[PDB]
C-alpha cells in the first residue's frame, strides 16, 4: 500500500485476474448512476474510492486511488482481518482450493484470520507489528487472546476501542443480512483505533479481488463476522 500525504493511498493492483477482479468491484459500487439501495449502504463501509490511477507516465502501471482509513489518527493502531469460512473462490481449481485451505486450514472452523496488526504502545513510545504467521499460528484455544493483543497498549487493555469495534462490525453484519447479491472470498476489515477514547475506531472493508455475483446470502462471511463479535465480546469481560 503506498500512503500518500494528501490524505489517500495507491493500492497496486494485482496480477490478473485478480487486479481486474477488484478494479471492477470499486467501479459497480462506486458508480455514478448506481441507485441501487444495497450498493449505497456498502459505500458506507469500504475506503472512499476515487478511481482508477496511474502514474503520468506509465499508463501500463495500475492502482485503486482509495481514502486513507488512518488519516484522521496520530497514532493509528491498526489490525487486517481476514473474514470468511472459504480463502477461495467458487471459480478455484482442486489446487487453488488446496492451496488455500493449507495456508490457513482453521478458516472453516474460526471463520476469520488475522493478517497482521501494527499497535502502539505508550510507554516505549513505539510500534509492535506482527505478520501473517502470527495469525495463521492462532487456534480456538488462543483466537481470543491472539486478537486481544491488538487492544493492549502495554499498560491496559483498550476495551472502548473493543466495544466501538463490535459497534462497528453490526452495522456491517447488517448489511450482509440484508443482500443476497454478493459473496466475497478472501476479502478483509481493516480496523483502526487512535493509540496515542471509543473515539475514532475505524472499521472498514478491504480486499475485493474475489467477489461474485450471488443468489444467497454470503454464509460464510456472516459466520465470520458472529463469531469475531463473539470473540471481541469475550474480551470485554477480561
Ligand atoms: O486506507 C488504507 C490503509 O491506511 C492501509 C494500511 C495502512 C497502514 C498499515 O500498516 C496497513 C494498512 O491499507 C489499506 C488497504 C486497502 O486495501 C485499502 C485501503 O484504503 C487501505
Sequence with gaps: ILQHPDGTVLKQLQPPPRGPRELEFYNMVYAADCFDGVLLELRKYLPKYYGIWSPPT????????????????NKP??????I?????????????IQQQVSKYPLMEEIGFLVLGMRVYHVHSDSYETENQH????????????????????????RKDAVAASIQKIEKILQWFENQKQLNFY?????????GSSGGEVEVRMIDFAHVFPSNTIDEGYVYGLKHLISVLRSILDN
Design 77 to 82: 493502531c491498526i489490525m487486517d482481518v481476514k
Design 186 to 194: 478472501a476479502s478483509s476489515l481493516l480496523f483502526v483505533y487512535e
Design 58 to 73: 506509465a499508463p501500463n502501471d495500475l492502482y485503486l486511488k482509495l481514502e486513507d482509513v488512518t488519516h484522521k489518527f
Design 134 to 157: 502470527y495469525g495463521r499460528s492462532l487456534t480456538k484455544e488462543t483466537i481470543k487472546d491472539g486478537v486481544s493483543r491488538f487492544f493492549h497498549n502495554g499498560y491496559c487493555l
Design 84 to 96: 470468511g469460512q472459504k480463502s477461495y473462490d467458487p471459480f478455484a481449481s482442486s489446487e487453488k
